[PDB]
């Protein structure tokens, strides 16, 4: 009973967080095995951030300039390198708390948990999605850089995001754990517009199935539609086009509820065309798009 | 930048979760020091749940009947007792992962994180509030009993909730860690109506301050009100009456933003009387009430 925006348990990731200081800048690092990963802008001063030449700035830094602290103890840095927009600090000790892990680059529409950290200390955990414009709508303040996004499959943590910056519009941009930014963003203090933030249609449909499973059914109608007819409606409302791949991924939810995917699309079409008329679905007065079909199956089945 | 429904990092609590089996029933237990806490209905069969005499059922159970497993290893039960609606199983080993902790009984309106668990394994973490009718709107399935709610102050975990049951309306009821139910609920399979679920006014005001801090300001108006005038509006909309204690707790938010509490109440009065007119506040199309003033200060300041 009930349906909530649920994050993964954060313990496996909390044991990887460290504080990295270079010069006068402090941010978060991720310690896995004998490497600490952090945003390369740790080597910058505020004056450098306008037009930084990271390669030239890094020449002036040596291993002893990177101060890595795990809780109360200091890690010894025996190597440093830059991989895209991240620094990899080789330390002399493997993290004993390193979980089984992978580095994954997610697609827009996919969700993940964020463990917001400051000074290497965790402050909170929340669930979010990689938006279609490659931004995330997080909750981050100065010092939160280096906080990571992840998914967990039983015992393996798949790290997908490392926080780097806030855009002038208060949305967030970052990299995968190979240091490649999601979207066209650069790690420079220059105004960068985000792009159209469309609604993740397949996720809205998944959430409507979650609503039916949990009893919220008022939006079910006597209609059906086609992929092309639904997509005309989706275009008008800045919803992502629905493909047969999306319909296929909703299969387990269609099977569990007995509601055909195209019938659920006709429900969504009517909700887009008429609004909610002051009503709510799963405690929300808007159509929620940050639950994937996998998230809905996981939560509705109790996967640990 | 940004404002999210954030839960506490769950690591300290994940290290306390165990699986408790009695007869054919399995649920979650909380292992702190040498005691495992779990809902007493672990001793019941489905047939017992209609009208159980817990004292009589417990007479037929011995220490060896309680199977406690922490991860893959078995804990030895050397004592058992019932405290209100919880069982306390004394084990021969102290939990090495026991964090600094306290047991607290929260007031309605207060928020906490829930670490949903199944078979002693964590599945997810989410933030919720103790509703004014003493129910919680969680996300729990069969096997989730014994999952706990908590708050964290630096290194100390304050456990406030242990999950016991779902009401026929799909809302959730449970106890504090002394085994006393929140509200009038009993651990018996008998239909128990919840009570009016009013809106936590002080929390809505806190969230409106969070919205102003993060840039959502369209709802600020040229009006003011009084506590008695606002409370006439709050009564009409099933909002909790606002007291001077609530106004006092909003003081830090009033000080940070420069918006007097009664001016923010006039904004809330107009939102109640006119609705949002298709607009949103912090990504929501309804007035959010599961952020306390302390939660807003914590998130907006970055407390770890
Ligand atoms: C203050 C803060 C809040 C949340 N998350 C992160 C931060 N910190 C930053 O964004 C620092 C930073 C780094 C880079 Cl690579 C670029 C900028 N560009 S800007 N935002 O237009 O000035 C700023
Ligand atoms: C199935 C489930 C889902 C979520 N959370 C918990 C559960 N399990 C339960 O509630 C079992 C249980 C225990 C008690 Cl003490 C009473 C009842 N009464 S009822 N709901 O009206 O049948 C049921």
Report DSSP letters for B102-126, one per residue.
Answer: EE--PPTT-EEEEEEEETTEEEEEE
Dist. CA B184–CA B135, nearest whole Å: 10
CA angle A127, A133, A138 (to 5 degrees): 30
Tell whether A8 and A135 lie within a shared domain: yes
Dist. CA B33–CA B125, nearest whole Å: 23
Dist. CA B130–CA B172, nearest whole Å: 10
Dist. CA B284–CA B265, nearest whole Å: 19
What is the number of structural domains in chain B? 3
Dist. CA A50–CA A45, nearest whole Å: 10
CA angle A281, B292, B11 (to 5 degrees): 85
Dist. CA B74–CA A206, nearest whole Å: 39
Tell me the residues of chain B between 201 and 220 that have a Cβ less than 8 Å away from chain A.
214-215
Tell whether B191 and B229 lie within a shared domain: no
DSSP A8: P
| CA dist list (Å): B194 to A195, B172, B186, B191, B200 | 46, 9, 12, 10, 16
Query: DSSP per residue over chain B, as a string?
Result: ------BPP-HHHHTTEEEEEETTEEEEEEEETTEEEEEGGGG--TTGGGS--HHHHHHT--GGGEEEEETTEEEPEEEEEEETTEEEEEESS--TT--EEEE--PPTT-EEEEEEEETTEEEEEEEEE--TTS-B-----TT-TT-EEEEEETTEEEEEEEEEEE-TTS-EEEE-TTSPBSTT--SSSS--------B-HHHHHHHHHHHHHTT--TT--S----HHHHHHHHHHTTBPPP-HHHHHHTHHHHHHH---HHHHHHHHHHHHHH--TT--BTTBSS---S--HHHHHHHHHT--
* Count of beta carbons in the 10 Å neighbourhood of residue A26: 19
Tell whether A237 and A217 lie within a shared domain: yes
Q: Is A94 helix (H, G, I), strand (E, B) or coil?
A: coil
Phi and psi angles of residue A229, each rounded to the nearest 5 degrees, phi first = -70, -45
Rounded to 10 degrees, the C-alpha dihedral B200/B203/B208/B211 comes to -130
Phi and psi angles of residue B56, each rounded to the nearest 5 degrees, phi first = -70, -40
Q: Please list the helix, strand and coil fractions of chain A in percent, rounded to the nearest 5, in that order.
A: 25, 30, 45
Atom from ligand 1 closest to the CA of residue A168: 21
Tell whether B104 and B6 lie within a shared domain: yes
Task: With CB atoms and an 8 Å threshold, state whether A302 touches B143.
Answer: yes
Tell me the residues of chain A between 115 and 134 that have a Cβ less than 8 Å away from chain B.
115-119, 121-126, 128
Tell whether B140 and B190 lie within a shared domain: yes
Question: Could you tell me if the CB of B181 is within 6 A of ligand 2?
Answer: no
Residues with Cβ within 8 Å of residue A275, at least 6 apart in sequence:
B278
Question: Could you tell me if the CB of A2 is within 6 A of ligand 2?
Answer: no
Buried b (16+ CB within 10 A) or exposed e, B126-137: bbbbbbbbbbbb
Tell whether B81 and B208 lie within a shared domain: no
Query: Which residue of A53, A117, A163, A166 sits with most ligand 1 atoms within 8 Å of its CB, as the best mutation to test the pocket?
Result: A166
Q: Which of B80, B99, B118 is the last residue of a domain?
A: B99
* Count of beta carbons in the 10 Å neighbourhood of residue B92: 10
Phi and psi angles of residue B98, each rounded to the nearest 5 degrees, phi first = -65, 120
Q: Which of A56, A74, A99 is the last residue of a domain?
A: A99
Tell whether B121 and B212 lie within a shared domain: no
Check which CATH number belongs to the domain holding A186 and give it. Answer: 2.40.10.10
Residues with Cβ within 8 Å of residue B61, at least 6 apart in sequence:
B22, B43, B80
Dist. CA A163–CA B260, nearest whole Å: 35
User: In which region does residue B92 sit, left (phi positive, over 0), alpha (psi from -120 to 50) or beta (all else)?
Assistant: alpha
Sign of CA dihedral A52, A58, A60, A61: positive
Tell whether B9 and B158 lie within a shared domain: yes
Tell whether A110 and A177 lie within a shared domain: yes
Reported as type and span, the H/E element at residue A22 is strand A17-22
CA angle B173, B179, B185 (to 5 degrees): 35
| CA dist list (Å): A159 to A113, A169, B123 | 10, 26, 18
> Ligand 1 pocket: which residues have CB below 6 Å?
A 41, 49, 140-142, 144-145, 164-166, 168, 187, 189; B 1
Nearest CA to B264 among B232, B220, B294, B230? B220
HSE (side-chain half, CA atoms, 13 Å) at A208? 29
Nearest CA to B8 among A101, A128, A121? A121
List, as own/partner pairs, every contact residues B25-28 make where C-beta atoms lie below 8 angstroms and the sequence separation is at least 24, other chains included: B26/B119, B26/B143, B27/B143, B27/B144, B27/B145, B27/B146, B28/B117, B28/B118, B28/B119, B28/B120, B28/B143, B28/B144, B28/B145, B28/B146, B28/B147, B28/B148
Asked if A38 is an active-site residue, the reply is no
Q: Which of B197, B219, B241 is the last residue of a domain?
A: B197
The two structure tokens encoding residue B264: 């923010």
The two structure tokens encoding residue A20: 């990295």
Q: Is A271 helix (H, G, I), strand (E, B) or coil?
A: helix
HSE (side-chain half, CA atoms, 13 Å) at B248? 3
Chain A residues with CB under 8 Å of B116 CB are 6
Reported as type and span, the H/E element at residue A116 is strand A111-118
- H helix intervals, chain A: 11-14, 54-59, 201-213, 227-236, 244-249, 251-257, 261-274, 293-301
What's the gap in Å between A167 CA and the centre of ligand 1? 7
Tell whether A141 and A179 lie within a shared domain: yes
Are B181 and B115 contacting, i.e. CB atoms less than 8 angstroms apart?
Answer: no
Tokens 């406690």, residue located: B68
For the purposes of burial, counting CB atoms within 10 Å of the CB of A186, is it exposed (0-12), middle (13-18) or buried (19 or more)?
A: middle
Question: Could you tell me if the CB of B50 is within 6 A of ligand 2?
Answer: no
Phi and psi angles of residue B131, each rounded to the nearest 5 degrees, phi first = -70, 160
The two structure tokens encoding residue A66: 């990177």
Residues with Cβ within 8 Å of residue A47, at least 6 apart in sequence:
none
Dist. CA A66–CA B268, nearest whole Å: 49
Tell whether B25 and B90 lie within a shared domain: yes
Instruction: Give the residue numbers of B marked as catalytic.
Output: 41, 145
User: Which residue's alpha carbon is at the smallest distance from atom 11 of ligand 1?
Assistant: A165
The two structure tokens encoding residue B48: 């017992």
Q: Is A122 helix (H, G, I), strand (E, B) or coil?
A: strand
Which one is catalytic: A145, A160, A163, A246? A145
Dist. CA A152–CA A136, nearest whole Å: 19
Task: Tell me which residue range forms the domain holding B183.
Answer: 1-14+100-197
Phi and psi angles of residue B122, each rounded to the nearest 5 degrees, phi first = -70, 140
Are B146 and B16 contacting, i.e. CB atoms less than 8 angstroms apart?
Answer: no
Nearest CA to A110 among A184, A186, A161? A161
Tell whether B6 and B122 lie within a shared domain: yes
């Amino acid at each position: 009973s009930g349906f909530r925006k649920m994050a993964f348990p954060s313990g496996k990731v909390e044991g990887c967080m460290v504080q990295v200081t270079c010069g006068t800048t402090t941010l978060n690092g991720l310690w896995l095995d004998d490497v600490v990963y952090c945003p390369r802008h740790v080597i910058c001063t505020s004056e450098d951030m306008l037009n930084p030449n990271y390669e030239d700035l890094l020449i002036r830094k040596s291993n002893h300039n990177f101060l890595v602290q795990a809780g109360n103890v200091q890690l010894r840095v025996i190597g440093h390198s830059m991989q895209n927009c991240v620094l990899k600090l080789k330390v002399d000790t493997a993290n004993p708390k390193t979980p089984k892990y992978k580095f994954v680059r997610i697609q827009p529409g996919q969700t993940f948990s964020v463990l917001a950290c400051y000074n290497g200390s965790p402050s909170g955990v929340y669930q979010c999605a990689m938006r279609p414009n490659f931004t995330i709508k997080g909750s981050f303040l100065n010092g939160s850089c280096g906080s990571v996004g992840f998914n967990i499959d039983y015992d393996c943590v798949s790290f997908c995001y490392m926080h780097h910056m806030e855009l002038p519009t208060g949305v967030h941009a970052g990299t995968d754990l190979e240091g490649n930014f999601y979207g066209p963003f650069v790690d420079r203090q220059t105004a960068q517009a985000a792009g159209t933030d469309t609604t993740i249609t397949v996720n809205v449909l998944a959430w409507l199935y979650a609503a039916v499973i949990n009893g919220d059914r008022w939006f079910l109608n006597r209609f059906t539609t086609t992929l092309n007819d639904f997509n005309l409606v989706a275009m008008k409302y800045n919803y992502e086009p629905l493909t047969q791949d999306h319909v296929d991924i909703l299969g387990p939810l269609s099977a569990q509820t007995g509601i055909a995917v195209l019938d659920m699309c006709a429900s969504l079409k009517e909700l887009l065309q008429n609004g909610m008329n002051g009503r709510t679905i799963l405690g929300s007065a808007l159509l929620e798009d940050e639950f994937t079909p996998f998230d809905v199956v996981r939560q509705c089945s109790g996967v640990t």
